[PDB]
Structure 1
Amino acid sequence: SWEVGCGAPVPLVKCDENSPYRTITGDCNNRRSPALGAANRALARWLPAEYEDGLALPFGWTQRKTRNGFRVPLAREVSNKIVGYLDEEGVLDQNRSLLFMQWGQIVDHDLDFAPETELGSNEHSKTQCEEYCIQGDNCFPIMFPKNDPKLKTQGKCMPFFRAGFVCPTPPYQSLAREQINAVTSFLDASLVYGSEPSLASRLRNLSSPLGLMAVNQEAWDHGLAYLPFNNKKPSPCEFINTTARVPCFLAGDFRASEQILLATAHTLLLREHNRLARELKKLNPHWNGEKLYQEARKILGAFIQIITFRDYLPIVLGSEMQKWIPPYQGYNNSVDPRISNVFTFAFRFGHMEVPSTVSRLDENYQPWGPEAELPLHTLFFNTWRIIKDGGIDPLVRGLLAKKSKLMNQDKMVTSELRNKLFQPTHKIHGFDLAAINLQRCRDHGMPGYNSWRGFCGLSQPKTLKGLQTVLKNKILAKKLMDLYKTPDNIDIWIGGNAEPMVERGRVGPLLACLLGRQFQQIRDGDRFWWENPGVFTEKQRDSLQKVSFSRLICDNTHITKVPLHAFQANNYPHDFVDCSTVDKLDLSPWASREN
């Protein structure tokens, strides 16, 4: 009927239908449709894109173009009036560790990245957006409202660049603009291994045939490995401390250095690979490098899948888990495994779970030195604090022993992200992630709040009194109505995040539906789902049932006291046990004898 062919990246690699291992690109997962859930393709559209001109321009682009007859509010104004708060006292989640926040971010980076556009190589267009706050082409600046403190110290706007779109990088489309997913849609450790062959090979330790990943040679961690440095310049991790001059790390995912606990999580995954691979080699001395790498990569992918679906999702979705993600029934080649455009906003519920400080703790899980607790904003693109301030062990104790922020209708996003965010190319701790999220919703042509309520079979408030009942909050509903005029116009990120949480979950009804549908699809539409008969043996699944974040720590750090349930709020030493009492990963079922 139409032309579902459009594609410049058209990697169309040769599919080995006999391959026991994933491609890096995610091609060849679906036999009938080989590019399905592959990287560098369009994000899936669950609903048609909504742009000001029907094609590509965001709502808010043209000041004289209403949405449903109302001006859309400035992203930064919604952020100041609704998302911001002063008092960090009483904000912490009494039953979620900081690792619950951190694992969310890890799983997100595995599933989606819509990278900002670039046109040429060296343009004035780049700085002209920052410098002159001029809207045009892929410059879509976040303008400050009249009373904004940042107007006094930071100029007229926050620079913002439109997300890249599929087919051309620069020329527009006759159909609607579709944003790219740069990573594999499968939950497959693409953030450890990469989603492009090139990056994927640039990262491996080929030198030895042991199937190990490439490590920092310039620096080490009390025996244990560092991610290699990206020695590309200019380095944002260098720029935040020109003295220490420590570059960003080099991971499967370009975002790995964005904050120090992400860099930490990633470090442990570079590690557990090698712990697994070496264990494989001891157990299978005949196996070559490929076999150890590919088999190592496949055990790590299975680890992330299990932690995500057994430990993480049930305490996000709560009473709604069983409704959207019922027990697995095997692989369904008819399920669309693509990450949706809306999911990339839904999964940003995580921004409301980030607390204002990060701690380094000791063996007695006590403050580590005199500057043990640090403000989050000092830790963006910060690699020097890991290398020159005691490696990742003290940060990992913090992940276990400290708590996530709880989402709160009156305390949504900490000022560490809402006012002090650091972005590369940009020299300030002065960005607003909430404002960015709202601007990006529009950039991506997102349907409004009630389109999504409708999509999920939920009520669609049309008046102030309607909104008050759905949000169970008069003041929040009144502020949203003063800004948006109609609930139809509420940006999905703030609409979804404003809903009271479901019984025993950390998101409201709308997000539970959007997140739950996506997670159900990425499991059921995945030919390499760990539990799909023929991916792993009866005996391996008995032994993969064993895996744990508690054990991943024990086995790749010098930490010897851990919680059993590492995502729940754990207080030392009362809710902690010694590592010996924690089920280990019995690799005996990977034992190969072919003689």
Structure 2
Amino acid sequence: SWEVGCGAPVPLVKCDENSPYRTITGDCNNRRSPALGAANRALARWLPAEYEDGLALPFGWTQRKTRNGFRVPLAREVSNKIVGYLDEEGVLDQNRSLLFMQWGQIVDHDLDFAPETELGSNEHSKTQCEEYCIQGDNCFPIMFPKNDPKLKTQGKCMPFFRAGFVCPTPPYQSLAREQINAVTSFLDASLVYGSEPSLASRLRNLSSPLGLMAVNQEAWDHGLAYLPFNNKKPSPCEFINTTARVPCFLAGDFRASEQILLATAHTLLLREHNRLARELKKLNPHWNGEKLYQEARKILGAFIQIITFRDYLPIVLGSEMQKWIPPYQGYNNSVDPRISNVFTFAFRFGHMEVPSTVSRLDENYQPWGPEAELPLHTLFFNTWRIIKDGGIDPLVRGLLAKKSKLMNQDKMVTSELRNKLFQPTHKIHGFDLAAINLQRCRDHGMPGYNSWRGFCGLSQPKTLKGLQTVLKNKILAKKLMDLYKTPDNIDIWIGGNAEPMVERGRVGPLLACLLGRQFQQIRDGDRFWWENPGVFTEKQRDSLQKVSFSRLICDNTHITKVPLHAFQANNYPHDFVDCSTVDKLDLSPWASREN
């Protein structure tokens, strides 16, 4: 008995039923329900939202209100007591390149984004939250526990604003609050091309009829392109260094400059689009701009799908991979391709894979300069270190030769993210990504850990001893129980990441189930999946089967020494080979001999 449904923020729908290309908004993928998987729609609810008032107030919002009879702990206290650690030694993943962490942030951004509510244009609402730490409406500040060092240097709280929700923006009252997903749910390279028509056009180079994506006209990388700058001010990339005054990049996705390796990944993707656009002109000089843009986009989207499903997921899900993501059988229109709310938290497992430093390496894969290695926090919203300090080639070698952090029950999230995160508009490198993850679980009305264990057909621990056995860790189970008196109350982000990893994977059972199911739906419910009969010719598919992340690098940098398997831990020069020994993406099958 759940209604026809609301959908006020989203406009009209008009589908061309013969189109060979995806829309920018994601609309029209599914023919029966053309809005499914479309951006700017509510995230799916795999389980009913759980709010303190059953409708919109997050747990923890009210002092006197218990969750199952107990107060929920402060997000920052959980972070300090369970998520933090001092010693970075021995914390690295002996078998995952830094590219593994990076590819995950990429895929993530291609799939979801629940932006903060916009109630700050010419408004002190945002200023007041920060300045006076007064909880109200969309201001839900993360307060400090009594013995927190930040209380001495940063004030009473870390500001936090509730995610935006569908239908109204001034309070509604009938059904549970549902947060928005601002990007397309399909793995379609929307992080490169955008999810709104407005932005999609602006990213394009219409000036010329070659199907190209716009490039920076102010800077170049030894002749190779850079993303254009986003000239919206205030710019956080300018803020972090007023001297260099280099602004953030403009990409298909809004968070592209959050950290230098992400920006780096976006640059590689753009170059790939243009290189494909140029190669297609040569094979089909008759094709117009639109035709070239779309066919290049199509090839790039398939690239991200293949790298993700064939290379990335197997080493994330490990032994659970075949269970949740059995080999492909074809497009199924009954499958819901929408990203679920819980998935946006399950995928945050990547936060425990980010290490404390980033390196620049030269062509011999040795330190590039006197400060080749830098602390991660000095790289948030840092674009000048790319434009004014070596370009992306050096950072990409670091991605290949350096390691990801390994999840560790005693060393979860690096202090660079847990104590030194920078957030636009605020002024300091003093935030905590972990605390924020937890406040956001509550903000989104996330059911607790046992609800999800149950959802996955896994036991549901009720006692310390049960939790110990599930976590296989006495001390961590003890701290969790002391913080949350019952496993029923454990926030999903933290409970899901506390479980030991499954054989050959990098996430526990619960998370493998949640991630596994979502990715299975993402593939099975995509009318444009690269392997779906009809989307690509069969000869074109034989050419796509050859793509690799190594080749993307060779084709789009001046790097000529790459590993064959980019995600595993690789050491130079042993595990490295010359680009010639690597499969190329042969584009002949795209020659349209139409005569």
Alignment TM-score, normalising by the size of structure 1: 0.99
Q: Is the 1:352–1:407 Cα contact (8 Å) retained in structure 2?
A: yes
Secondary structure of residue in 2 paired with 1:479: helix
- 1:435-461: per-residue Cα shift (whole Å, max 9, x none)? 000000000000000000000000000
Distance in structure 2 (CA, Å) of the matches to 1:380 and 1:265 = 14
Distance in structure 2 (CA, Å) of the matches to 1:582 and 1:157 = 52
Q: Which residue of the partner structure matches residue 306 of structure 1? A: 306
Q: Is the 1:119–1:170 Cα contact (8 Å) retained in structure 2?
A: no
Q: How far has the Cα of 1:118 moved from its partner?
A: 1.7
Q: How far has the Cα of 1:593 moved from its partner?
A: 1.3
Deviates more, 1:217-226 or 1:116-125: 116-125
- 1:345-402: per-residue Cα shift (whole Å, max 9, x none)? 0000000000000000000000000000000000000001000001000000000000
Q: Which residue of the partner structure matches residue 185 of structure 1? A: 185
Distance in structure 2 (CA, Å) of the matches to 1:590 and 1:55 = 52
Distance in structure 2 (CA, Å) of the matches to 1:2 and 1:58 = 22
- 1:186-226: per-residue Cα shift (whole Å, max 9, x none)? 00000000000000001000111110100111111110011
Q: Is the 1:24–1:197 Cα contact (8 Å) retained in structure 2?
A: yes
Q: How far has the Cα of 1:25 moved from its partner?
A: 0.4
Distance in structure 2 (CA, Å) of the matches to 1:468 and 1:172 = 42
Secondary structure of residue in 2 paired with 1:430: strand
Q: How many equivalent residue pairs?
A: 595
Q: Is the 1:50–1:447 Cα contact (8 Å) retained in structure 2?
A: yes
Secondary structure of residue in 2 paired with 1:319: helix
Q: Is the 1:12–1:27 Cα contact (8 Å) retained in structure 2?
A: no
Q: Is the 2:227–2:250 Cα contact (8 Å) retained in structure 1?
A: yes
Q: How far has the Cα of 1:163 moved from its partner?
A: 0.1
Q: How far has the Cα of 1:155 moved from its partner?
A: 0.1
Distance in structure 2 (CA, Å) of the matches to 1:259 and 1:175 = 37
Secondary structure of residue in 2 paired with 1:67: coil
Distance in structure 2 (CA, Å) of the matches to 1:114 and 1:66 = 27
Q: Which residue of the partner structure matches residue 507 of structure 1? A: 507
Q: Which residue of the partner structure matches residue 216 of structure 1? A: 216
Secondary structure of residue in 2 paired with 1:95: strand
Q: Is the 1:55–1:175 Cα contact (8 Å) retained in structure 2?
A: yes
Q: Is the 1:501–1:508 Cα contact (8 Å) retained in structure 2?
A: yes
Q: Is the 1:22–1:29 Cα contact (8 Å) retained in structure 2?
A: yes
Q: Is the 2:112–2:344 Cα contact (8 Å) retained in structure 1?
A: yes
- 1:224-245: per-residue Cα shift (whole Å, max 9, x none)? 0110001111100000000000
Distance in structure 2 (CA, Å) of the matches to 1:126 and 1:434 = 21
Q: Which residue of the partner structure matches residue 158 of structure 1? A: 158
Distance in structure 1 (CA, Å) of the matches to 2:146 and 2:537 = 63
Q: How far has the Cα of 1:139 moved from its partner?
A: 0.2
- 1:529-583: per-residue Cα shift (whole Å, max 9, x none)? 0000000011011100000100000000000000000000000000000000000
Secondary structure of residue in 1 paired with 2:313: helix
Distance in structure 1 (CA, Å) of the matches to 2:363 and 2:576 = 12
Superposition pairs of residues 325-344 of structure 1, within 5 angstroms? 325-344=325-344
Q: How far has the Cα of 1:120 moved from its partner?
A: 5.5
Distance in structure 1 (CA, Å) of the matches to 2:583 and 2:118 = 48
Q: Does 1:36 align with 2:36?
A: yes
Q: Is the 2:380–2:422 Cα contact (8 Å) retained in structure 1?
A: yes
Q: How far has the Cα of 1:123 moved from its partner?
A: 1.4
Distance in structure 2 (CA, Å) of the matches to 1:89 and 1:407 = 13
Secondary structure of residue in 2 paired with 1:205: coil
- 1:393-438: per-residue Cα shift (whole Å, max 9, x none)? 0000000000000000000000000000000011000000000000
Q: How far has the Cα of 1:168 moved from its partner?
A: 1.3
Alignment TM-score, normalising by the size of structure 2: 0.99
Q: Is the 1:360–1:397 Cα contact (8 Å) retained in structure 2?
A: yes
Secondary structure of residue in 1 paired with 2:511: helix
Distance in structure 2 (CA, Å) of the matches to 1:397 and 1:117 = 38
- 1:38-73: per-residue Cα shift (whole Å, max 9, x none)? 000000000000000000000000000000000000
Distance in structure 1 (CA, Å) of the matches to 2:226 and 2:554 = 17
Q: How far has the Cα of 1:171 moved from its partner?
A: 2.6
Q: Is the 1:20–1:535 Cα contact (8 Å) retained in structure 2?
A: yes
Distance in structure 2 (CA, Å) of the matches to 1:42 and 1:13 = 16
- Would you identify which runs of 4 or more consecutive aligned residues in structure 1 move more than 4 Å? none
Q: Is the 1:52–1:59 Cα contact (8 Å) retained in structure 2?
A: yes
Q: Percent identity?
A: 100
Q: Is the 2:120–2:126 Cα contact (8 Å) retained in structure 1?
A: no
Q: Is the 1:12–1:35 Cα contact (8 Å) retained in structure 2?
A: no
Secondary structure of residue in 1 paired with 2:306: helix
CA RMSD of aligned residues (A): 0.7
Q: Which residue of the partner structure matches residue 275 of structure 1? A: 275
Q: Which residue of the partner structure matches residue 11 of structure 2? A: 11
Q: How far has the Cα of 1:480 moved from its partner?
A: 0.2
Q: Is the 2:7–2:167 Cα contact (8 Å) retained in structure 1?
A: yes
Secondary structure of residue in 2 paired with 1:391: coil
Secondary structure of residue in 1 paired with 2:344: helix
Q: Is the 1:352–1:405 Cα contact (8 Å) retained in structure 2?
A: yes
